[PDB]
Structures are given as C-alpha cells and as structure tokens.
Amino acid sequence: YFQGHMYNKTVSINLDSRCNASCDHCCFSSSPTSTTRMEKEYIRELVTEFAKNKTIQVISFTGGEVFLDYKFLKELMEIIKPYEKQITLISNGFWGLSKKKVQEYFHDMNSLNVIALTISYDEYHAPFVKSSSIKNILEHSRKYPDIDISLNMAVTKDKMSNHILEELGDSILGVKITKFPMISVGAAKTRIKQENIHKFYSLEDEDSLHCPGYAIVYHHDGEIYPCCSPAIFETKITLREEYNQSFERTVEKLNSNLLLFILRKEGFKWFLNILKENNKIEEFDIPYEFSSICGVCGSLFNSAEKINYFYPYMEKYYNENF
Amino acid sequence: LYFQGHMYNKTVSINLDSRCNASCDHCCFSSSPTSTTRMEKEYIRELVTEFAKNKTIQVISFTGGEVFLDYKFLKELMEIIKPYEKQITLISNGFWGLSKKKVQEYFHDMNSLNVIALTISYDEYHAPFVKSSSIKNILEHSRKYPDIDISLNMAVTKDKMSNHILEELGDSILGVKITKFPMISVGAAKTRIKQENIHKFYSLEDEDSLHCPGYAIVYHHDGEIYPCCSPAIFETKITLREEYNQSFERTVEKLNSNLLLFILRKEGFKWFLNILKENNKIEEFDIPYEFSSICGVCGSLFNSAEKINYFYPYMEKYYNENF
Ligand SMILES: Nc1ncnc2c1ncn2[C@@H]1O[C@H](CSCC[C@H](N)C(=O)O)[C@@H](O)[C@H]1O
Ligand SMILES: Nc1ncnc2c1ncn2[C@@H]1O[C@H](CSCC[C@H](N)C(=O)O)[C@@H](O)[C@H]1O
Ligand code: SF4
Ligand code: SF4
Ligand code: SF4
Numbered sequence: 001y002f003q004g005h006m007y008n009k010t011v012s013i014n015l016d017s018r019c020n021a022s023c024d025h026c027c028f029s030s031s032p033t034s035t036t037r038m039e040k041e042y043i044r045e046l047v048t049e050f051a052k053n054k055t056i057q058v059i060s061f062t063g064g065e066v067f068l069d070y071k072f073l074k075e076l077m078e079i080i081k082p083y084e085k086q087i088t089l090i091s092n093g094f095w096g097l098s099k100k101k102v103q104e105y106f107h108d109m110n111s112l113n114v115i116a117l118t119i120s121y122d123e124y125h126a127p128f129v130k131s132s133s134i135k136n137i138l139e140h141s142r143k144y145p146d147i148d149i150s151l152n153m154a155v156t157k158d159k160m161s162n163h164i165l166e167e168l169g170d171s172i173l174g175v176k177i178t179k180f181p182m183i184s185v186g187a188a189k190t191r192i193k194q195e196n197i198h199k200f201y202s203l204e205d206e207d208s209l210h211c212p213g214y215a216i217v218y219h220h221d222g223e224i225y226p227c228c229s230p231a232i233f234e235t236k237i238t239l240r241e242e243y244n245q246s247f248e249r250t251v252e253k254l255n256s257n258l259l260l261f262i263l264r265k266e267g268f269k270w271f272l273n274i275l276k277e278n279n280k281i282e283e284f285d286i287p288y289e290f291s292s293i294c295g296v297c298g299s300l301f302n303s304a305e306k307i308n309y310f311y312p313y314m315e316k317y318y319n320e321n322f
Numbered sequence: 323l324y325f326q327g328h329m330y331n332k333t334v335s336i337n338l339d340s341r342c343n344a345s346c347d348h349c350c351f352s353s354s355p356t357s358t359t360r361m362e363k364e365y366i367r368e369l370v371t372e373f374a375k376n377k378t379i380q381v382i383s384f385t386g387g388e389v390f391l392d393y394k395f396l397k398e399l400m401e402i403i404k405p406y407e408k409q410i411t412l413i414s415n416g417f418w419g420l421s422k423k424k425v426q427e428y429f430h431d432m433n434s435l436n437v438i439a440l441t442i443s444y445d446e447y448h449a450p451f452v453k454s455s456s457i458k459n460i461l462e463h464s465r466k467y468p469d470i471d472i473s474l475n476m477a478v479t480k481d482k483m484s485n486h487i488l489e490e491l492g493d494s495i496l497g498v499k500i501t502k503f504p505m506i507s508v509g510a511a512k513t514r515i516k517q518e519n520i521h522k523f524y525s526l527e528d529e530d531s532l533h534c535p536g537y538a539i540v541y542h543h544d545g546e547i548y549p550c551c552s553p554a555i556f557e558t559k560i561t562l563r564e565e566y567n568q569s570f571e572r573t574v575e576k577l578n579s580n581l582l583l584f585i586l587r588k589e590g591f592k593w594f595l596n597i598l599k600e601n602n603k604i605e606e607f608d609i610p611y612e613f614s615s616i617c618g619v620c621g622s623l624f625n626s627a628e629k630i631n632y633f634y635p636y637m638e639k640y641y642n643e644n645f
C-alpha cells in the first residue's frame with residue numbers, strides 16, 4: 001500500500017545520558033556528570049502520546065542508566081499501564097546489590113507489562129557494578145517467566161569476559177547471553193586500542209553490507225534516529241524536523257527519507273561505490289576493516305559534508321527510478 | 323466477525339529419527355548410532371507434505387537424533403516445503419562442521435530453503451563426539467548468512483558447567499545467542515548423571531512462578547504426538563495421537579479441547595498443587611519440593627492415569643462454574 005510502515009509498532013526513548021557507571025567503551029560517553037537529556041515534562045508528553053498511539057505495541061527505555069531515577073521510570077511505566085503496551089528495559093543492573101530492591105523492581109516490572117529486561121555486564125561494566133549484583137537479578141528473574149531475560153556482554157580481544165561468566169555461576173542458566181564486538185564510537189574511540197576491536201568485515205565484501213533494520217529511537221540529544229545501533233548517534237541522520245513532532249510524522253519521515261530508502265533497497269555498496277568512483281575513501285576516513293555493518297554506516301554519515309556529498313547521486317537515483 | 327479460534331497451529335516440530343552419531347550421557351532420547359526408534363520415511367514425507375500444504379502452519383522445525391546424519395532425507399523434506407514458502411528451523415550437534423565442503427554446501431541449502439534459525443548444541447556432554455574446531459567452522463561460516471538466526475545451546479550440570487568450552491570457541495561466538503540450561507532428569511540423564519549434580523533452583527514455594535512455558539505440537543520419533551517440546555512431557559500420560567493417520571487439524575482440535583491443558587494454561591500449576599495440598603496428597607503424588615525446571619512439576623503431577631483422573635471431578639466443577 002506504498003507506505004506500509006513496518007516501523008510504527010515499536011519506539012524507544014533514551015531517558016538520560018547520566019549513568020552511575022563510566023564504561024570505557026560507552027558509545028554515549030555516559031557518566032555521573034553527563035548532562036545531555038530531553039526535559040522530564042517533554043518525556044512525559046512523548047510517553048503519553050506513545051501510550052495513546054494505536055499502532056505502537058512496544059515501548060523501550062534506555063539511557064544512560066534508566067534505573068538511576070527509578071521514581072521517574074516507574075512514573076512513565078504507570079502512564080503506559082492503562083493503555084496495556086508492552087515495555088522493554090535495558091540496565092547495567094547496579095540496583096541488584098539489594099535482594100530486597102530486586103524483589104521490589106521485579107514486582108513492579110511484572111505488574112507494569114515489562115516483557116524483556118536486558119542486563120549489560122562485562123569487563124567494561126565490572127569496575128562499576130559488582131558480580132553479586134548481576135547474580136541477584138538473574139537469579140530472581142526465574143520467578144518471573146513472562147520477563148524475557150538477556151545478558152549482553154561488550155568485548156574486545158584483551159577483555160573477552162571469560163572469567164566474568166564463570167563468576168556469575170549458575171545465575172546465567174536459562175539466560176540468553178550475547179557477546180558482541182565494539183562499535184568504534186564515543187569513549188571506545190579514544191579509550192580502546194583499535195587493534196583490540198574484532199574486525200569481521202571489510203570494504204570489499206559488499207554482499208554482506210546491509211543494514212539489519214530500522215527501529216525509531218527518540219534520543220537523549222533531542223534528535224530521532226532510524227535505529228538503536230551505537231553507530232547511529234554520531235551520524236547526522238535525524239528524523240526530527242521540529243520540537244513538537246508527532247509519531248505519525250516521525251514514521252512518515254522515516255518512510256519518505258530518500259537516503260534511508262536507498263540504503264535499505266541498495267545496501268551500503270551504493271554509497272561505497274560512489275566514494276570509490278570519486279576517490280573519496282581516504283578523504284572521508286572510511287576504515288578498511290570494521291567490527292560490524294554499523295561501523296560502515298557511522299563512517300559514511302558522521303558529518304554534514306559526508307551526507308551532503310551523496311545528495312546529487314540520490315537526486316539522480318530518484319529521477320531515474322520512480 | 324470470528325473471535326479467536328484454535329491456538330498452537332502456527333508451528334509444528336517433527337522428530338525425524340532417534341539415530342545419532344553421538345551418545346551424549348544426558349540425552350533425553352538416549353540417542354546413539356544404534357538407536358532404532360523412528361517413524362517410517364514415507365510416513366514422515368506425508369506429514370511434511372501436509373504441514374507444507376497446511377494453511378495455518380508458518381514454521382516447521384526438525385529435530386532428532388541428528389537430522390544432518392541423513393542429509394539427503396532432510397534436504398528432500400526441505401524441498402517438499404519450498405514451493406509452499408514455510409519457514410524452517412533446525413537443531414544439530416554440528417558434527418558436519420569438520421568438513422568445509424559440508425559447511426559451505428549446507429549453508430547454501432539452508433539459505434535457499436528458507437531456514438530461519440539454526441541451533442547448535444555443544445557442551446561437555448557433546449564434546450567427546452564432536453570437535454571444538456567443527457563447531458567453530460559452523461559459527462564462523464554463519465556470519466555470511468545474516469538471515470539465519472544462530473544459537474548455541476549448552477546443557478550443563480554442577481560438575482560440567484562448560485566454562486572452558488566457550489573460551490576455546492574464541493571470537494566465533496560473537497553475535498551468537500548462547501543459552502546454558504540445566505538437565506531434565508529423563509533418558510540417559512536419569513541413569514548416567516548423579517541427581518546431586520542437576521541444578522534444582524525452582525521450588526513449590528514459587529507457586530506464582532509455576533507456569534508452563536507454552537504448548538507447541540511435536541510429532542515425535544516414537545510415533546506419538548506431544549503438546550510441547552520439553553523432554554519431561556514423555557513421562558506424563560498427556561498425548562495427542564488417537565490414530566495412525568491423524569490430520570494436523572485434528573491434532574490442533576484435540577490440543578485446544580483438552581480441559582486439563584486449558585486449566586493448566588489459564589490457571590497455572592498452582593490450581594493442581596492447591597488441590598493436592600488441601601487434600602494432603604503432595605507426598606502421595608511424589609511431588610518434588612525442588613526441580614531443575616517447571617516441567618519437573620508437570621512430569622510428577624500427570625505421570626499416571628490415576629493422577630490425571632484424580633483431578634477429573636475438580637476439572638468438571640471448573641468447567642461447570644466457568645463457561
Ligand atoms: N561502543 C559500543 N559498542 C558496542 N556496544 C556498546 C558500545 N557502548 C555501549 N554499548 C552497549 O550498549 C548497550 C546499551 S548502553 C545503555 C543501557 C545501560 N547503561 C547498559 O549498559 O546496558 C549496553 O549493552 C552497552 O554495553
Ligand atoms: N536430559 C536433557 N535435559 C535437557 N536438555 C537435554 C537433555 N537431553 C538432551 N537435551 C538437549 O536437547 C537438545 C536437542 S537434542 C536433538 C538435536 C541434536 N542431536 C542436538 O544435540 O542439538 C540439545 O540441545 C540437547 O543438549
Ligand atoms: S555502557 Fe551503559 S552502564 Fe556503561 S557508561 Fe554507557 S550507559 Fe552507563
Ligand atoms: S546499518 Fe546504520 S541504520 Fe542500519 S542499524 Fe546499523 S547504524 Fe543503524
Ligand atoms: S543430545 Fe543431540 S547429539 Fe547428543 S546423543 Fe542426544 S540427539 Fe545425539
């Protein structure tokens with residue numbers, strides 16, 4: 001039906017860049033002193049709109065650390081509750097230190113339709129959160145089979161989290177664990193040696209270079225991104241045109257965005273072939289090797305000059321097709 | 323204009339054979355190269371043809387045994403499904419990863435035959451039968467096929483937690499969903515593993531946490547049809563086959579009209595446990611106080627015709643009160 005929009009069923013909101021941790025890989029460079037965030041009242045309005053929206057099924061919350069201002073998170077989950085939307089959360093699990101706190105939060109999550117909780121723990125998070133805190137959360141989650149539990153571990157060649165998993169003991173039984181490489185963005189750009197980042201892809205294997213898929217995120221910088229990959233936040237791709245924009249308008253802009261249409265239909269080779277034919281790979285600092293497809297994305301579109309360079313080619317594509 | 327009809331009709335699993343190249347000490351099926359339990363090949367072709375033609379089934383899953391052992395047969399079944407465009411899932415011990423030719427050829431076939439998920443099982447129990455490098459070859463090659471969801475399932479006990487297994491896989495596990503899970507004490511796990519080494523972190527006190535993970539129809543290699551994928555269901559007297567040539571529509575109808583399973587789903591295990599507790603039947607029914615999974619309660623509640631029949635008057639009362 002031309003505009004079918006298979007992106008209006010989920011939305012993510014990044015509540016704050018503030019975090020109790022200061023992870024050396026952090027794509028947001030989050031820390032207790034981070035000040036980037038949308039205003040609380042503005043977030044209440046966004047959440048109220050997402051709860052009332054008839055197509056949205058799932059609302060996800062991320063940061064930063066969303067459990068740091070738990071009173072506000074619970075307040076937003078209560079706005080959604082009469083509308084019966086599903087909620088997902090991601091956390092560093094610092095709150096797991098008290099088993100009593102873990103029991104209160106799980107009681108709330110279960111009564112507020114939280115269907116998934118992802119806990120991030122690895123050698124990068126370890127200086128900030130104790131292993132026992134993660135174990136308390138993972139162990140208590142067994143009492144709530146309707147909450148899908150995941151453990152996400154960000155790794156490098158020198159920090160593969162092998163001993164982290166062992167210290168977690170049997171608390172990880174039944175938990176989906178995913179170890180993933182670093183995206184070279186934020187604190188990972190300056191605090192991690194590039195040689196320690198796993199390189200799985202190169203500029204020549206163009207057949208594997210396809211975006212995994214779009215998902216709308218209202219970010220703590222006040223912008224709107226087409227996915228939640230750490231790489232996207234340093235790009236200049238935004239779906240925001242004004243302060244008070246509806247989700248119908250955000251979805252319409254995502255579906256009519258020519259760059260994103262070309263990226264989805266043609267893959268990253270359409271853009272890489274333009275830079276290669278114009279001898280711009282070195283001028284635009286495209287890395288030869290990357291840890292993920294998102295690494296190409298971030299390097300192609302992380303400046304106004306780099307994005308604008310494609311505009312005459314996109315205009316030609318629009319005229320040729322359609 | 324039609325409210326919700328039958329549930330559990332969007333997926334089906336078929337267990338192709340109990341034969342396997344491995345002889346894992348935990349195996350719920352007691353699979354080995356000498357296992358003879360299996361439905362006939364032609365009978366399976368008919369089942370797969372019916373599932374492919376079926377209007378509601380979206381996903382067809384294959385398991386064993388080791389389904390890649392008789393690759394020619396598996397590929398034939400996947401080819402029957404192909405014109406109907408159903409999604410397929412596979413689970414394997416990955417013994418075929420030792421051969422680079424098999425890895426390339428099998429991934430090409432899976433991608434062209436709409437295989438959306440492949441689960442590889444590797445742990446200390448599988449390790450004597452399949453080399454680590456074989457698993458590594460499969461995981462590494464899977465990166466070239468991003469539309470195939472890859473999972474690593476590791477069966478563990480207190481004495482065999484598979485800690486070194488993960489380390490020796492290196493970075494081939496990056497992006498792979500790993501799940502370590504405890505044992506269900508069925509099959510070879512009943513006699514070859516000490517009960518003390520099986521994790522038992524679920525209890526009866528977690529009454530509100532006692533819910534069945536969900537029903538999924540399984541056409542098993544013993545020729546029976548089961549309402550779920552748990553190794554524990556085989557020991558219950560809960561089955562879905564009434565005759566040799568039974569349609570999938572009939573299997574679904576039987577599952578949806580099973581009053582015990584309706585009550586179990588809607589009310590949870592506490593409905594049955596509360597009846598036992600009120601009449602002091604927990605010890606008479608050998609209900610364990612601790613268990614590795616909720617399926618452990620299931621197995622103990624319904625493992626005899628007399629236990630199932632004990633609930634009949636209460637379920638009849640429930641049907642009359644509700645509906
Ligand atoms: N440079 C980077 N590359 C890859 N993953 C990164 C990253 N920076 C952060 N992440 C991951 O992005 C996820 C969300 S971070 C925000 C949620 C919360 N503070 C948490 O840590 O879970 C975490 O799993 C984190 O490890
Ligand atoms: N007693 C038991 N308890 C729990 N999981 C078991 C089990 N016996 C077998 N399994 C698991 O059931 C799954 C399917 S076994 C059949 C598929 C294939 N041979 C394979 O090993 O993957 C495997 O992950 C296996 O480890
Ligand atoms: S990765 Fe998560 S826990 Fe670590 S600094 Fe970033 S926001 Fe905080
Ligand atoms: S390829 Fe680009 S748009 Fe697609 S998920 Fe990765 S960063 Fe986002
Ligand atoms: S667990 Fe899988 S690989 Fe091991 S014996 Fe059983 S069927 Fe074979």
Ligand code: SF4
Binds near residue numbers: 534537551617618621
């Ligand atoms: S609780 Fe019973 S019916 Fe449900 S999956 Fe486990 S064994 Fe099967």
